[PDB]
Structures are given as C-alpha cells and as structure tokens.
Amino acid sequence: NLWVTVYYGVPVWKDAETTLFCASDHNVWATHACVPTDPNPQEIHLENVTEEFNMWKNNMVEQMHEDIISLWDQSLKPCVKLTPLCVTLQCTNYAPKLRSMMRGEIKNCSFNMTTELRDKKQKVYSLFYRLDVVQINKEYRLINCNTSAITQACPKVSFEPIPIHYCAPAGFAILKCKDKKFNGTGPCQNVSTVQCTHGIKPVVSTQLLLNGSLAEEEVIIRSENITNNAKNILVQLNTSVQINCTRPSNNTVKSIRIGPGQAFYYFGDVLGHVRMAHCNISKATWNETLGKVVKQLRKHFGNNTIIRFAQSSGGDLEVTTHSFNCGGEFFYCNTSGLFNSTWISDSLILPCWIKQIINMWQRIGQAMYAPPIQGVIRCVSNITGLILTRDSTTETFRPGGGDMRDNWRSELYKYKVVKIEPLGVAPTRCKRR
Amino acid sequence: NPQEIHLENVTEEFNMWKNNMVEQMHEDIISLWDQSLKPCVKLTPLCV
Amino acid sequence: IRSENITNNAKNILVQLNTSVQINCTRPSNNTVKSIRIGPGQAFYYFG
Amino acid sequence: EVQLVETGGGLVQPGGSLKLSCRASGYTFSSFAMSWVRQAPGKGLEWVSLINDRGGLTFYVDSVKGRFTISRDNSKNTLSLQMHSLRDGDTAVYYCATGGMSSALQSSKYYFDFWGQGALVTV
Amino acid sequence: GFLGAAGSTMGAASMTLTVQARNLLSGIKQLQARVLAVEHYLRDQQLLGIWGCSGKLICCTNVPWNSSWSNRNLSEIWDNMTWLQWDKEISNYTQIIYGLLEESQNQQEKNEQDLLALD
Amino acid sequence: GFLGAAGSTMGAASMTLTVQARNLLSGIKQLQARVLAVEHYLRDQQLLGIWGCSGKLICCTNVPWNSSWSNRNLSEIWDNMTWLQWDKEISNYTQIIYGLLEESQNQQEKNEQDLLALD
Amino acid sequence: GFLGAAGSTMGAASMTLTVQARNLLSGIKQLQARVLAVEHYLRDQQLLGIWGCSGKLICCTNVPWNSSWSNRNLSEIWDNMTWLQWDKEISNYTQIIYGLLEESQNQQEKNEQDLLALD
Ligand SMILES: *[C@@H]1O[C@H](CO)[C@@H](O[C@@H]2O[C@H](CO)[C@@H](O[C@@H]3O[C@H](CO)[C@@H](O)[C@H](O)[C@@H]3O)[C@H](O)[C@H]2NC(C)=O)[C@H](O)[C@H]1NC(C)=O
Ligand SMILES: *[C@@H]1O[C@H](CO)[C@@H](O[C@@H]2O[C@H](CO)[C@@H](O)[C@H](O)[C@H]2NC(C)=O)[C@H](O)[C@H]1NC(C)=O
Ligand SMILES: *[C@@H]1O[C@H](CO)[C@@H](O[C@@H]2O[C@H](CO)[C@@H](O)[C@H](O)[C@H]2NC(C)=O)[C@H](O)[C@H]1NC(C)=O
Ligand SMILES: *[C@@H]1O[C@H](CO)[C@@H](O[C@@H]2O[C@H](CO)[C@@H](O)[C@H](O)[C@H]2NC(C)=O)[C@H](O)[C@H]1NC(C)=O
Ligand SMILES: *[C@@H]1O[C@H](CO)[C@@H](O)[C@H](O)[C@H]1NC(C)=O
Ligand SMILES: *[C@@H]1O[C@H](CO)[C@@H](O)[C@H](O)[C@H]1NC(C)=O
Ligand SMILES: *[C@@H]1O[C@H](CO)[C@@H](O)[C@H](O)[C@H]1NC(C)=O
Ligand SMILES: *[C@@H]1O[C@H](CO)[C@@H](O)[C@H](O)[C@H]1NC(C)=O
Ligand SMILES: *[C@@H]1O[C@H](CO)[C@@H](O)[C@H](O)[C@H]1NC(C)=O
Ligand SMILES: *[C@@H]1O[C@H](CO)[C@@H](O)[C@H](O)[C@H]1NC(C)=O
Ligand SMILES: *[C@@H]1O[C@H](CO)[C@@H](O)[C@H](O)[C@H]1NC(C)=O
Ligand SMILES: *[C@@H]1O[C@H](CO)[C@@H](O)[C@H](O)[C@H]1NC(C)=O
Ligand SMILES: *[C@@H]1O[C@H](CO)[C@@H](O)[C@H](O)[C@H]1NC(C)=O
Ligand SMILES: *[C@@H]1O[C@H](CO)[C@@H](O)[C@H](O)[C@H]1NC(C)=O
Ligand SMILES: *[C@@H]1O[C@H](CO)[C@@H](O)[C@H](O)[C@H]1NC(C)=O
Ligand SMILES: *[C@@H]1O[C@H](CO)[C@@H](O)[C@H](O)[C@H]1NC(C)=O
Ligand SMILES: *[C@@H]1O[C@H](CO)[C@@H](O)[C@H](O)[C@H]1NC(C)=O
Ligand SMILES: *[C@@H]1O[C@H](CO)[C@@H](O)[C@H](O)[C@H]1NC(C)=O
Ligand SMILES: *[C@@H]1O[C@H](CO)[C@@H](O)[C@H](O)[C@H]1NC(C)=O
Ligand SMILES: *[C@@H]1O[C@H](CO)[C@@H](O)[C@H](O)[C@H]1NC(C)=O
Ligand SMILES: *[C@@H]1O[C@H](CO)[C@@H](O)[C@H](O)[C@H]1NC(C)=O
Ligand SMILES: *[C@@H]1O[C@H](CO)[C@@H](O)[C@H](O)[C@H]1NC(C)=O
Ligand SMILES: *[C@@H]1O[C@H](CO)[C@@H](O)[C@H](O)[C@H]1NC(C)=O
C-alpha cells in the first residue's frame, strides 16, 4: 500500500574528488585572483553522524601540493633569469685566516659575466656559500650549472607563509572531524560541516613540522601502515617547542645590472665577524617532547621495547637536514643533536648551513636563486610536529621526511570533501492524484 | 543593426569617474597591445 | 574515388582502397647516437 | 495510559455560539490527528470534525461545515472547537478523540484510538 | 544549518529540504568546477522534470513500492532511519525506481493528453 | 522593447514580463561572465521553485501583506509607482518576504502531501 | 536508443521523448562547448516556461492551428510523416507559432490572476 515519493534536498552525500578554490583573509602565495574569505565562516555541527575518514586517501592533499607548486612557479616566472651566471669562477676562500666553524664556508669568487651592452663585460667579485659552488685562485662553477637553469627570485616578493583557506564549490561540502585522539583514519564521532577549511600556512620544512596546529590532548602518531618501514610516521604534538633560529652575520647585499631591464643581486660583504647560522632549542622542552613521543610509540610497538632516535642516514641535504625558510633565507640545520638518544623502559645549538641555489619540490631541471637578505636574520618558530621514519629488541627512528605531501597532511588530516546527492526516494502513503 | 530602446520617464544617475567600463577598456587595450607585439622579433642584440 | 569536383584539375582525388598493399620500409644502417650538453639542463643529440 | 479531558459549557440559545476545549496528556499531542465525535442524547454517535496533527488541514461533516471551526495548539497540548448557530439538531455530548488520520509518513489509522469522556452541549 | 539534519531521522530531516536545495547552487580549473556544479544541478532538475516533479521538493507519484527494494515498516523508515542509511539500502535499486518513475510519467502525460482531447 | 516599460507604472509594466525574461538569458574572462550569468539565472529560477512558482511569471501566494513593509494603497502602488521606486521601498524587507514565502511553500507542500495520503 | 525514432513517424516517435531529453544534457574550447550546451538547454527550458510548459514534455495549449501553416490531415501528419519532414514544413512559421504561444500564456496568467482575486 506504499508509493514511491521523490525528495529533493536530501542531506545525503558520497565521497568525491573535486577542485577546491583558494581563499585568503607582495607574497608568493597571495594573488588578486584568489577570492577573499568570509569575515565569519559558518560551521554546522552534525549530531549523530559518524563519517569515515582516511587522511592518506584524501584528494585535498594533491590539490594543496599542485596549487602550491603552481603559485610558486607563477611567482618566479616574472623575474630575472640567471643564465649568464654559468661562467667559470675564480675563487679563493673568504676570510681565509679566520678561526671559526665557518672556515672555507664562504668563497670569494671573481667572474666576467656581462652588462647592459652586449659588447662589454663587467668583472664581478661576490661571495658564495661553499654548498653553492663546486670545483671544476681555483676554478669553480655554480653547483646547478651541471643540472638546470637558474631563475632569480624577485627580491620584492616575500617568502613568508600566508594562511590559505580551501573552499568547496557549490554542490560539495567539507567535513571536519573535530574528534580527540584522532589518528587520521576510521570513524569520527564529532563531524561538523564547513564550506572552507581553517587557514593553512604553506610552511615548507623537512624533518620537523613548523608553525602548524597542535593536538588537543595528547601527542598523536599517524601512519598509513605503522608496520611498513616504507611509510613515514607523522607525529602531531600537543604542545609546541620554540626554536629561535638566526643568521647572526650582518651581511651587506650589492647588485649589478646584467642586461636591459635585468639586475643581479649577490652577497657582497660581511660586516663584523663571520658567524655560523644556528638554531636554539631548549634542551628540557625537547627532552620532554621526545619522552611523550616515546610513550605514544610504545603504545604501538610494545611497552617493553627500547626506542632509539638517530640522525638521518643519508640522501640529499634537503632530507638529511632540517630545511626551512625564515627571514628570506633557506636554512639547512643538522639536527643530529636532537635525534640522538636511547629510551629504555641550557639551550642546544644546531649548526645550520645557508644555500642560495634551491631545488624545491624535488624537481630536477628548474633551479631558483634566493637573493641574499641585508642584515642579521632572527626568526622564532614553533615546532608543532615531527616526521619520523624507522629501520628486534630496539626500534630505531630517524627524521626521514622530504616528501612535501606529508606536510600538507599534517594540517589536512581532519578534512574530507564530499559530494551532495540531493535526490532520493522513499515509501509513503501518498498516491499521485 | 543594433536595437536601442528609449526609456521614457527614467532618470538614471551617472558618474563618468566611477565607471567600471573605463578600467575594462584600458586593460583590454593593453592586453591586445601585448598580444599583438608578443609574436614579433625581439631586439635584445641591439644593446651594443 | 572521391573528389570535390572530379572535373576540376585544382582539386585532389582521394582513392580509398578495398584491400591494402603491405610496404616494408627500413633504414638498414646500424646508427650509433651520441650526445653532448649545450647548456644548463639542456642536451643535444646527434648522429654519431 | 493517556488522559483526554473535555471542558465546555451547557445550555445555549439558538443562534449563539460556544467554544469547547480538550486537554491531552500521556502522549505526544503533536504526533496524532484529533477529531470531534458527537452523540445525541437518544441516538448513536456520529463524526463531527477532523484536524490533522500539524493543524493546517481541517475537515467537517456537512451538517456543521459552515459554522464550526476546529483548531489545535501543539504548544499547549489542547484542541479547541468553536461552534456557532447551535441548532436543536446539534444538541449532543461532544467527545474528543485521538486518531482518524495520519500525516502521510505514519502508518494509516482511519479510527479513533483514544477517547475522552465528553462535554454535554444543549440548546 | 546546511546538512544539520544529516544525522536526524528521515521524518524530521524532510522538514529542512530548502536549506540544502539553496546551498546546492549558491583559473580554468575553478571555472570547470563551477560548470560541473551547474551541470549536476541541471541533471537533477531535468530528472525531476522527466518525472513530473519540476516544481516540488516533495513529489508524490503513481509508482507502487515493490517491498523487495526494502520491506521495512513505514514507521521504521521514517522515525528510526536517517537519510544516509536509507540511501545505502536503496542504492542497489535506485536505477530501477528511476526507470519506473520515468515510465509512469510518460503514461500519465499520454493519459492527460487523451483526456484533454475529449471535447 | 527590453526595459521599455522601466519608466512605466507597475500595472502597465507587468504586461511585458516575457521581454525581460527572454533577454535575461539570451577569453577566460568572457567565459566567466557567461557562467556567472547562468548561475544568476538559475539562482532566480531555483528561488521561484522553492516558492512553488517554477512555471509562472506572475505567481500568487498565501503570504499576507504585513502593511508595515509598505502601507500604500493598492491603486497608488500599481497606477502611480514604477517598479524601480517600488524596489527601492521594499529592498529593506525583501529578505523577510522571501523567508516567509519559503516557509509558506514548505507548509503548503506538507499539507498537499497529507491530503494525498488520505485514501 | 538516442534518436532511434528519428526515422519513425511522428506518432510512434512521440513515445520516446525522454530518451532525447536525457541525452541533451548528459581546454578552453571544450569548456566553451559545455557552457554553450548549457545555455542552449536553458534557452529551451525558458521558452517552455514562458509558454506555461515548464514541467511537461507534451504540453497542450490554447493556440488554434491556423491551417495555413500546414493544411495536412491529422492522420497524415501523425501516421505518415516523420519529425524531420514536419520541421522542414513548419520552420517558415515557427516564429509565428512561438509568438502566439507567448501571447496566449500571458493572457492565461492574467486570467488566472483575476480568477484568484475573486474572493
Ligand atoms: C612561524 O611564525 C613566526 C611568526 O609568525 C615567523 O616569524 C616571523 O617571520 C617573518 C619573516 O621572517 C618576520 O617578518 C619580518 O620582520 C622584520 C622585523 O624587523 C622585518 O624587517 C621583515 O621585513 C619582515 O617583516 C616576523 O617578524 C617574524 N615574527 C617574529 C615574532 O619574529 C616564522 O618565520 C614562521 N616560521 C616559518 C618557518 O615560516
Ligand atoms: C675578493 O678578493 C679580492 C682580491 O683577490 C678583493 O679585492 C681586493 O681588496 C683589497 C682590500 O681588501 C684591495 O686592496 C685590493 O686592491 C682588491 N683587489 C681587487 C682586484 O679588487 C675583494 O674585495 C674580495 N671580496 C670581498 C667581498 O671582500
Ligand atoms: C641561544 O642561547 C644562548 C644561551 O645559551 C643565548 O645567549 C644569551 O642571550 C641572552 C639574551 O640576549 C643574554 O642575556 C645571555 O648573556 C646570552 N648568553 C650567552 C652565553 O651568550 C642566545 O641569545 C640564544 N639565541 C637566540 C637566537 O636567542
Ligand atoms: C670526422 O672526421 C674527423 C677527421 O677529420 C674524424 O676524426 C679523426 O678520426 C681518425 C680515425 O678515423 C683519427 O685518427 C683522427 O685523429 C681523428 N681526428 C680528429 C681531429 O678527431 C672523425 O672521427 C670523423 N667523424 C666520424 C663520425 O667518423
Ligand atoms: C675575464 O675575461 C678576460 C678576457 O681577457 C680574462 O683574461 C679574465 O681572466 C677573465 N676573468 C675571469 C674571472 O673569468
Ligand atoms: C652533475 O649532474 C649529474 C647528473 O646525474 C650528477 O650525478 C652529478 O652528481 C652532478 N655533479 C655534481 C658535482 O653534483
Ligand atoms: C565536539 O567539539 C565541540 C567543540 O566545541 C565540543 O564542545 C563537543 O562537546 C564535542 N563533541 C563530542 C561528542 O566530543
Ligand atoms: C600534553 O600531553 C602530556 C602527556 O603526558 C600532558 O601531560 C600535558 O598536560 C599535555 N598538554 C596539553 C596542553 O594538553
Ligand atoms: C587508527 O585508529 C583506528 C581506531 O578504530 C584503528 O582501527 C586503526 O588501525 C588505527 N590506525 C593506525 C595507523 O594507528
Ligand atoms: C602493512 O604492510 C605489510 C607489509 O608486509 C602488510 O603485511 C600489512 O598487511 C600492511 N598493513 C595494512 C593495514 O595494510
Ligand atoms: C648592520 O650594519 C649596518 C651598516 O649600515 C648597520 O646600519 C646595522 O645597524 C647593522 N645591524 C646590526 C644588527 O649590527
Ligand atoms: C627564544 O626567545 C625567547 C625570547 O624571550 C627566549 O625567552 C627563549 O628562551 C628563546 N629560546 C631559546 C631556546 O633560548
Ligand atoms: C651533523 O653532525 C654530525 C657530527 O658527528 C656529522 O657526522 C653529520 O654528518 C652532520 N650532518 C651533516 C648533514 O653533515
Ligand atoms: C607558539 O606557541 C605559543 C604558545 O603560547 C603561542 O602563544 C605562539 O603564538 C605560537 N607561535 C606561532 C608562530 O604559532
Ligand atoms: C557522388 O555520388 C552522387 C550519387 O548521387 C553523385 O550525384 C555525385 O555527383 C557524386 N560525386 C562525385 C564527386 O563523384
Ligand atoms: C567543377 O569546376 C568547373 C570549372 O570550370 C565548373 O565548370 C564545374 O561546374 C564544377 N563542378 C561542380 C559540380 O561544381
Ligand atoms: C647494432 O650495433 C650494436 C652495437 O652494440 C649491437 O649491439 C646491435 O646488436 C647491432 N644491431 C644490428 C641489427 O646489427
Ligand atoms: C541525535 O539522537 C538523539 C537521540 O535521542 C536525538 O535526541 C537528537 O535529536 C539527534 N540529533 C539530531 C540532530 O536530530
Ligand atoms: C519486484 O522486483 C522483483 C525483482 O526485480 C520482480 O520480480 C517483481 O515482479 C517486482 N514486483 C513489482 C510489483 O514490481
Ligand atoms: C511617461 O509619463 C507619461 C505621463 O502621462 C505617460 O503618458 C507615458 O506613457 C509614460 N511613459 C511610459 C513609457 O509609460
Ligand atoms: C509585521 O512586521 C513587524 C516587524 O517585523 C512584526 O512585529 C509584525 O508582527 C508583523 N506582522 C505580520 C502580520 O507579519
Ligand atoms: C521504417 O519503415 C517501415 C515501413 O513499414 C516500418 O515498418 C519501420 O518501423 C520504419 N522504421 C522505424 C524505426 O520505425
Ligand atoms: C493565418 O495566417 C494568415 C497569414 O499570416 C493570416 O492572414 C490569418 O489571419 C491567420 N489566421 C488565423 C486564424 O490566425
């Protein structure tokens, strides 16, 4: 005695993969083409809804990664190309008589290059870091002239991360987990519906997660497959540890013209003494942070095991060190003083190297030259999470990292995007006419 | 042959200096200019 | 046999066969290819 | 299990009016349709009116269709009937009853599930 | 609130259909996303039109319930189930139901045409 | 003519609604402009659908006029005013009116559903 | 099948209208093609709406057949002709017919408005 009744506007949805649009409340990740955000987003809590989430199958991560790369290339495209820099350099060490850890780290190189008029050349003396110059007065070349073209980043465009919000197009919705102790997978009991995500800063770092969000109650250890050594483990801390990192040298920046409408910026002089770039991490706070991480790891690996931390075993400097950008400079900090401990049942100083030629996003064939920044650089960041990898009685963990998609996951783990299916049918007692 | 419809008893308020058609005109002219010059010979070697 | 205008010498005639004829075509020489780099991130391939 | 109690007056003159009211308890008032059924002192009982659960729809028996108004208040849990032009043929005991209709998404009824005791209206 | 009734039972959830109906419509990739959203909206409106439901959110039809699609009691479906559980149960029969609705509307339109032909 | 009645009074202007209705629909920036025009058209058609007016240009409803929105006489509104002056007067209450129209249609659809349930 | 009835007579062909109705909607150039397809769909739906046919595939009207447009017998048109031949015959008068349909619907809407005004 029942009849089919058609309902339109049914609050039902299915998993979907769509294109999300940026929003923001000169910067590399800012644009006039990115829609302003609402002054007050509306979050609708969904009572008695238990959506199943999986942070490692989330299509928002690929969209985040691709859009960040696209914005990066768009920002570097309208800038000065450094093709003429691939010349033979004649170099000596800078401050060759200096006693320091930075003994030979800066080289004073001379080269002909060229100038506004094609018939003339302007001899240039400039300082380069050891990591940017490879032997070939001694003859050297820039490290990237054997691999790719170098594009100079525009000195007027800031590299400071700016929060980016992702907003679903009409017909789609984003479900925010909001549950406590959520390990990135399985049912979520406190699911709410939003149109736009919280602001996510495009912070680029390896090994350590900087300026992220924090766990509400406990350190959360997330892995696609905790028993698979080929997967990375993302650890989200409940409390941050402050890292004060600096380039104490007072660097003087000089510039020359290299063509019509083009200018090359380079590291000219160091005023005062040459000092090593480094990061300050409080020893007590870090030790407590690792103790908490070890307790949470023991919950998955056994209460009676021994957990050991060790330095990165190898690979490119981007993955063996803590790479990050602050102050407009790219720091590569050893971190061997942090991940060196065995866990059985004063401030620390991390040496850092600075590079001018950066090969970001693991893309070989497109290099960027970071202009030097005038003066002394000091930045204070919050370490809000860790990336760990692992290799019996003792389980050894290493910084790992290097795959930028995992950093996006550290913020996107709580969001899922779904498609709305407003049509449905149900039996009723209603007969048409 | 465009069709113009006269509006009797309509008194619209105009402001030529707040008109968004001017910015569209300017931007489109610049865009057409650059599009026309783009597929042409570059004179980089003339700086001698 | 298809032509826009079979009586117009300025048009091409397209002939579609009902059976194919096999053509075996070759470059019998055993050519060795060499390559050099010509710039950062660029390489030139040539017949060696 | 439930309680339904009629309130109303007694003797009126022909051509006048009288409002009757019933209070419900023990069940969700807003979930059931309500009806009025009347029994003349010497006759059997007959249906007078029907109101849906929400109250938007009302139906009447032809003999009262142009005079009676049926209304319900789901916040007060009360049913009211305003009668006009009480005729001698309208003298009866008027009972409130729960049932008689369902709002499409509920199992059908077409019966009067619960009854009150009745208000006696005379002319 | 948009989808606020998603965890609510079908009966109570059916009272907020206009909230989702309004929310469904409200670089090259973003433009493609907007065009796709419009195409999906129109596909749903066209499908309602085919069934004779072009102007309604709650549309009654002449297709009987088979009971093989779901044999639950009407009170169980509307008072105990949510729309997500119901969709999970009926998705296997959704194309069958849609085909029956299209055929029923075609028959209704022919019958109305013939009734209108009578003078 | 398109908008020819714009300066005409509301009564006479209401006789040419199909002219504007037809005219409303008839590089990347231009494609965005076309998509936006389509989205605006659909938003207006969806809103009419929500009110139960999906197939009409002049749609009568069950929402009473409050008189606080405008207390002008009916002859003053239809014989002396233009549609632009009227819109200027009612824009402060337009969202209130739209909310009432949506609620009224939801109540009407539930009432029709219940009447159809009676066998 | 889509357009399977194209060579079938008008009578038999009128029984498969939903097949084409469903098929009509189902780089920058491709996106332009999709937007244009949507605009054409909406133009046809708007035109049906103007005539009061927004929810029907077979819509009866109040416009009489002039017989000058085509003086064929009804059985000749529906049992012997295909829809393509018919369209070829009526294309010269299609704009006249559309204008009459629009005027008829405007008159019908005004008449319904006046009937609704009577209390
Ligand atoms: C994590 O967040 C902190 C705070 O938001 C970041 O520190 C901030 O970094 C920016 C850029 O390096 C600093 O802006 C600069 O300030 C100096 C002040 O003299 C100015 O001269 C520069 O032109 C520029 O505006 C900002 O002051 C600094 N904030 C603090 C409190 O020190 C940090 O860099 C973030 N971490 C990462 C990895 O991005
Ligand atoms: C790099 O080395 C050159 C010399 O090899 C430096 O130039 C000399 O600077 C001294 C003063 O310190 C002068 O007396 C010499 O006459 C300079 N020679 C030339 C050829 O310029 C140059 O300053 C060094 N670069 C930096 C940044 O200090
Ligand atoms: C890194 O830690 C050292 C201490 O180990 C900091 O040096 C101290 O800084 C304070 C504040 O300027 C001074 O009052 C102390 O006298 C300093 N001590 C020494 C031994 O120099 C240093 O400033 C920290 N680095 C950063 C960037 O904050
Ligand atoms: C092109 O010709 C040059 C010589 O003109 C070849 O190079 C010579 O090869 C012979 C061996 O066949 C050597 O003995 C000479 O010393 C080579 N001379 C030089 C200058 O290299 C060259 O090999 C020829 N190219 C090819 C592809 O055979
Ligand atoms: C610059 O070019 C001149 C050309 O005569 C050469 O003598 C000189 O050694 C070159 N210097 C460097 C640093 O390449
Ligand atoms: C030059 O490029 C090759 C490309 O494989 C690389 O293996 C080599 O290490 C590069 N040279 C230096 C000094 O890095
Ligand atoms: C969901 O999160 C909100 C955050 O304010 C909290 O108030 C609420 O109690 C949470 N619900 C559950 C079931 O944890
Ligand atoms: C972080 O977790 C530790 C685990 O022991 C707990 O003691 C500490 O209070 C937590 N802090 C916050 C702010 O939740
Ligand atoms: C995450 O938590 C759920 C809880 O049900 C568990 O089933 C799942 O295996 C956990 N996954 C990891 C990687 O810890
Ligand atoms: C993790 O990887 C191992 C590899 O052997 C596999 O056996 C195991 O089933 C995987 N776990 C899950 C949850 O897929
Ligand atoms: C760096 O040197 C410049 C030289 O002009 C001076 O003005 C500036 O104050 C110095 N900064 C520091 C931190 O020593
Ligand atoms: C970072 O700077 C703040 C500034 O007050 C200081 O208190 C803190 O100790 C510094 N961090 C370290 C590790 O020294
Ligand atoms: C960090 O310091 C240790 C000190 O033993 C050294 O062995 C290691 O190579 C350093 N890291 C890098 C990337 O060189
Ligand atoms: C770091 O954490 C502290 C905790 O009180 C917070 O006040 C500060 O704003 C955080 N900084 C950043 C950059 O997130
Ligand atoms: C193709 O065949 C048709 C058959 O009716 C004929 O009329 C036409 O002229 C032919 N064209 C050519 C180019 O052969
Ligand atoms: C073919 O071309 C000749 C050129 O003189 C013309 O006379 C003839 O009519 C053409 N044929 C057709 C079928 O157009
Ligand atoms: C061509 O020469 C190469 C030389 O290594 C040899 O390996 C290959 O088999 C030769 N092929 C033919 C077809 O002679
Ligand atoms: C969730 O279930 C409880 C169970 O009593 C109910 O009261 C509540 O209204 C439900 N949530 C929603 C949004 O209906
Ligand atoms: C119900 O579905 C079954 C299986 O498709 C079919 O055999 C049966 O005839 C259907 N009954 C009705 C009334 O549609
Ligand atoms: C403009 O006002 C005059 C006043 O009499 C009226 O006759 C005329 O028709 C109006 N214009 C239009 C287009 O209605
Ligand atoms: C008219 O509007 C006023 C102000 O919003 C409100 O107080 C009043 O109740 C409304 N009256 C009606 C009949 O809607
Ligand atoms: C084609 O014409 C024949 C003539 O008898 C008819 O039987 C057949 O059904 C027609 N084709 C279609 C698709 O109607
Ligand atoms: C039929 O069309 C002709 C020519 O347009 C016209 O003169 C005649 O009045 C029309 N008749 C009807 C009934 O519309």
Author numbering:
A (entry chain A): 33 to 57, 66 to 141, 150 to 184, 188 to 309, 312 to 323, 323A, 324 to 397, 412 to 457, ...
B (entry chain F): 80 to 127
C (entry chain E): 272 to 309, 312 to 321
D (entry chain C): 1 to 52, 52A, 53 to 82, 82A, 82B, 82C, 83 to 100, 100A, ...
E (entry chain B), F (entry chain I), G (entry chain G): 521 to 546, 572 to 664
Q: What do the study's own words say?
A:
We produced a subset of Fabs with HCDR3s ≥ 20 aa that were not BG18 type I sequences and found that 7 of 8 showed detectable binding to the BG505_B23 trimer by SPR and 3 of 8 showed high-affinity binding (KD<100 nM). We determined cryo-EM structures of two of the high-affinity Fabs (RM_N332_07 and RM_N332_08) in complex with N332-GT5. Thus, an antibody having no recognizable BG18 sequence features other than a long HCDR3 can bind to the N332-GT5 trimer in a manner that is highly homologous to BG18. The approach angles and relative heavy chain-light chain twist of all seven N332-GT5-reactive Fabs clustered around BG18 and its inferred germline, whereas the other N332-dependent bnAbs approached the epitope with a wide range of angles as has been described previously. Thus, the BG18 type I and III Fabs structurally characterized here have clear potential to develop into BG18-like bnAbs. Furthermore, we provided evidence that N332-GT5 induced a wider range of non-human primate antibodies with a common BG18-like epitope footprint and binding orientation even in the absence of substantial sequence similarity to BG18, which suggests that N332-GT5 can prime a larger number of BG18-like lineages than originally anticipated.
